[PDB]
Amino acid sequence: EDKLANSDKLAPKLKRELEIIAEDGRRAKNHLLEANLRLVVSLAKRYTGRGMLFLDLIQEGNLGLIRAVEKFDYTKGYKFSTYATWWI
């Protein structure tokens, strides 16, 4: 999606393939997010019962978790949970 975001002229079939890869990447974004909904629910129930509703805490942690997945890299050899927990 970064390559197709550029203004350089490429093949239209190549741009279609890049859009397909971008759609697959967005599907991966989703799949990771519904993978980690359970852990953000657990860490939100860790912080409940203090004047703020449970589902509000879950959704705010979900915002923190999409922040986490925006700032996650595979170069460091650690699991997603221990890095996501700080942002949650």
Q: Is 51 in the site for DNA (CB under 7 A)?
A: no
Q: Is 86 in the site for DNA (CB under 7 A)?
A: yes
CB-CB neighbours of 65 under 10 Å: 22
**One-letter identity of residue 40:** V
How many whole angstroms separate alpha carbon 78 and alpha carbon 24? 24
CB of 52 to DNA, least distance (A): 10
Q: Is 50 in the site for DNA (CB under 7 A)?
A: yes
The span from the first CA to the last CA of the chain, in angstroms, equals 27
CA 64 to chain centre: 9
Of the candidate spans 1-9, 18-26, 43-51, 73-81, the one that interacts with DNA by CB under 7 A turns out to be 43-51
Q: Is 46 in the site for DNA (CB under 7 A)?
A: yes
Q: Is 38 in the site for DNA (CB under 7 A)?
A: no
